[PDB]
A paper describes a structure:
Human bestrophin1 (hBest1) is a Ca2+-activated Cl− channel essential for Cl− transport in retinal pigment epithelium (RPE). Although the structure of hBest1 is still unsolved, two Best1 homolog structures, one from bacteria Klebsiella pneumoniae (KpBest) and the other from chicken (cBest1), have been previously reported. Overall, the channel is a pentameric assembly with a single ion-conducting pathway, which varies in diameter along its length and is constrained at two narrow points: a “neck” contributed by three residues (I62/I66/F70 in KpBest and I76/F80/F84 in hBest1/cBest1) on a transmembrane helix, and an “aperture” formed by a single residue (I180 in KpBest1, I205 in hBest1, and V205 in cBest1) on a cytosolic helix. Here, by electrophysiological and structural analyses, we show that the neck and aperture in hBest1 are both indispensable Ca2+-dependent gates, and their dysregulated opening by rationally designed or patient-derived mutations causes Ca2+-independent leak and elevates Ca2+-dependent channel activity.
Numbering used by the authors:
A (entry chain E): 25 to 289
B (entry chain A): 22 to 206, 208 to 289
C (entry chain C): 24 to 205, 209 to 288
D (entry chain B): 22 to 288
E (entry chain D): 22 to 289
The structure:
């Protein structure tokens, strides 16, 4: 990539610069730039650790959707094995919540998936709100509440599936917070500029003791910094459509297929 | 910030170090780079662990504000799933939940909550809330009376009361976590680490000038920037409930919460 | 592995040889630049290994929860329905089937024999037909206590106490499927650590001469031993040395539940 | 903060090293700085990790005291929300909950809790609590009896009794967790060898620097020693979180805050 | 202290090193500090991460045993508060709860729980516990039957049965956790690598140091090696938390504390 190509030529410039720039006293020893490189590597490791934690919290939150939606459908079959109208409808809302969450995080438009799973009557209320995924939850709770006032659910077994709508609410909230949070941007931008300036200004610090071999031993260590710095660029925002990013769309079909299998479809 | 000035000190110090260089060899004073390499590496390790503790303190603060929104969403949702017809209780409870959020904001920011309280609640409750050592505690007490009176009237069983009571429990744990991060910021985690990061940076050009005849200023400023950049980020993370640009945007988060709760109750 | 150590011992020897021309060709491969590169690689190896250990530790805990949850579900059936041993043995068979199925699911092998050894062939087909057979097994564990509730021998309360244990086992199922399915981070380190070990003696040749190959191999031992432990801790459901003994764990589970039903 | 002592000893070792350096090489005794940077960086790594473990102990202690306030605040809230008219019982339980906080504090500080018990509770139960060898735990059971008597009198249902029983379980986890944190010198050697090891490195450091610095040895040596000593000292401070240092837990503040909260919270 | 073998051996290596370095100049062998610093710094980072794992695992073991004391305290509290008249049931459930602690100590120490079981329970129930291949787990089942018998006799409702049942769940995560920790060491590879790499590094160190320290090599090579060995040893003093060594957990003392707590709450 560009960065190391720039470094190899910049390394080339440093060799020519050293010889033809001898008159000015540009003595640049290796010891100071070693203290600097060790320092910013300590910071990159700590930063990349913080980014990686953010990525697996995202991955955990989505793991909880599949768990929570499997157990509420199983509770539904176990507690009310006859009410397939309630099961068809509730599975619709559970599946739509997943796709709505996915389109929300991807800042893309959920209408194709929501008509596919819901009557456009309801699909009109959901998109009329600024919080469409939250209202899908509130509607799924309404189906469960209906069963309670009909005397089909007691308060006890109502509460046990109420607790699964709680697990899903914490997913909704946490995902929004992860999307919304901008704390990583300040640290990383200072590190990114610092990492870059350090690599390009580095052959001028090696050329005194390395001569021609400067390009080789400079393009190498530039690779190991840019690569490890770029790694945090991938985990900082994990809801991206990138192959590196969570396969959010594979995960929603798994959700839909599984909730379809459990409902005798 | 204070980082631009401390950068300018370092430059001046490099110039002082070059002139100090002529007197340095006869003076019998030699400052090699190797002892400062060791000191600089140890300082970087300590700042690494420190920033990590500051970032976690910051992450938890926004996590705690994350579940105000979550707990209040589901409490409003339970109210409508269990008592779909009690819109009076829906509205009073929502006004308490909205008041809890704004008063929590005022509590962490050490500012006056009466205006926000007077917009959302009747005046006799505002006096009740402000007489309390913990006004946001008193608000959870009042919301609890709403669900508690619905229970007395027989419109809530003990089961469905407990379900909503749990959400007021979650709000209390949010309340105590925020109070805890405010009253528990360690001193030497910034006493040492800014005095020594400061003193290390001003002393560095002197240790560097023997090896770099005129480049002492440039490389010394690069090193000082990265130590001061990394060090000050931890104090931009040290007051997550503060009011700087990198602190939590708690006003916007209170508007988000209230707009969320109003949207759920048809307003 | 050992091939790589032997190659470093050679590659040191090529540096041994190629040193005769360092002066005439103009080479100054000095040590301090490689001393900085190795220290940074160690920092990233330490962090990557620590993240690899966490996935392994979390995988270990998920499987611990299977044994804990299935134990106390069986405790509850005995404490609450002590004379219902037709139901005890049916539910226990699904629980044992659950843990073997998850082993096969994470290992990508055939559960049919295990399912047949433990369940009637009628339900072995229902399980072998679902998208997630482990998921179906829990569904069928839930109809057993579900029916006891409409048999009226479980109240909604005591039903829910055992329902909670099935929620616990679903969290394990999702936890494992998330770790089994969840490149650069390694790919960066996998490529970089190797190239540093082959180039190091050429920069070491300069002061170690003949004792170049053994410090070069000593250093490379420390680095490669650490990097490969991360790759096997990364795949905790694999078959490597320090991978989870899943077969032993399912047997422990089985002879635990076959100890609590009479 | 006896850092000043081994700072002033460090200056001494520096001047012996200076005057005795010339004498010192009488047969080939030589101390370079490179072995002392390998050793010093290693010691720095182990200090960061140790300090990170000590900080975690501090954060857990604060979290445990946090939920004392949270659990006690919601327990008395549930009492007023569920039984608004039974204030004879609110006063009895509030004083047990307040006595639990103070009794917990005296137990961790190894101080006499009699004055705070005789001020909150009737003397017949004060002697029952002092007779027991686990007094804080006996306060919990006593608070539990109050809830239990309200349940045998039909004023509480099993469900509503259950919601409050939960909060007593929260306090039971606090007590045990606090007791485990107090009794954990465990491997005190981990900081005990490190305290000495850091001490020997800082005494020997000027002898390893005089060849490079000469007269500037005591300045660079005290700076390196200060950095290492203070970070070590912060750790020995953090890992005794119930101690009496300033960086420790304001236990007094929290006990008074919850008493005021509970009092202001009922009249 | 397998440490003085490696520490004292370091002194012998240092003397062999001085004579050896003048010969090394003649031979073609030559050792510098800087390569070993790269080694030593790499080892210390790895030593630091391993020891953090070893420490976390020791902390989890101490946590789990603390839960035994917490959960049995509240189980006893609930019983008195909910069934204050039921002293016979109080005493029976307390003995199982005490028996579980001791039986968990014995099993983690692979020692014989028979004498303790017979001091606390009727022999007819000691036989049942010892017949099982998982005795401590069976102690939980018997305690659950005491609670369950109270539920069927109508003295406990399903609600208050469940409040107590949740506490036996707490004890079941302790038992699982301890069994897991008792069988899952911090990887053999981790400690093996670090055992041999610190060893080899400690013996070959005085060689690389001899050119810089002349006659001072042993007084510094033993100081450096001592740091790396004491820090690798601490991971081997946190590996065996259920053993009987001084820095292991005082499980016997922790078990006595639990017993006298529960007798304190039941008058006995
Ligand atoms: Zn769940
Ligand atoms: Zn159906
Ligand atoms: Zn919640
Ligand atoms: Zn309404
Ligand atoms: Zn010059
Ligand atoms: Zn459990
Ligand atoms: Zn049976
Ligand atoms: Zn000498
Ligand atoms: Zn709580
Ligand atoms: Zn009152
Ligand atoms: Zn508990
Ligand atoms: Zn009794």
């Amino acid at each position: 990539i560009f960065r190391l190509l720039l470094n190899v030529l910049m390394s080339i410039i440093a060799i020519i610069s050293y010889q033809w720039y001898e008159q000015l006293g540009i003595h640049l020893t290796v010891a100071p730039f070693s203290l600097l490189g060790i320092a910013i590597a300590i910071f990159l490791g700590f930063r990349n650790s913080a980014s990686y934690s953010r990525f697996v919290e995202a991955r955990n939150l989505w793991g909880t959707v599949l768990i929570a939606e499997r157990t509420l459908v199983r509770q539904l079959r176990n507690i009310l094995p006859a009410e397939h109208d309630a099961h068809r409808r509730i599975v619709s809302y559970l599946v739509a919540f997943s796709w709505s969450l996915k389109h929300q995080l991807r800042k893309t438009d959920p209408t194709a998936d929501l008509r596919r799973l819901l009557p456009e009557e309801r699909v009109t209320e959901i998109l009329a709100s600024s919080m469409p995924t939250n209202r899908i939850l509130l509607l799924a709770g309404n189906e469960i509440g209906q069963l309670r006032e009909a005397g089909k659910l007691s308060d006890i077994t109502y509460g046990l599936m109420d607790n699964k709508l709680d697990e899903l609410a914490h997913v909704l909230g946490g995902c929004e917070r992860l999307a919304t949070t901008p704390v990583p941007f300040a640290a990383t931008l200072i590190l990114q500029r610092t990492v870059y300036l350090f690599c390009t200004l580095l052959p001028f610090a090696l050329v005194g003791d390395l001569h021609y071999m400067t390009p080789f031993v400079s393009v190498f260590i530039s690779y190991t910094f840019l690569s490890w710095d770029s790694l945090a660029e991938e985990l900082e925002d994990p809801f991206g459509t990138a192959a590196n990013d969570l396969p959010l769309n594979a995960m929603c079909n798994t959700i839909e297929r599984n909730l379809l299998d459990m409902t005798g479809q």
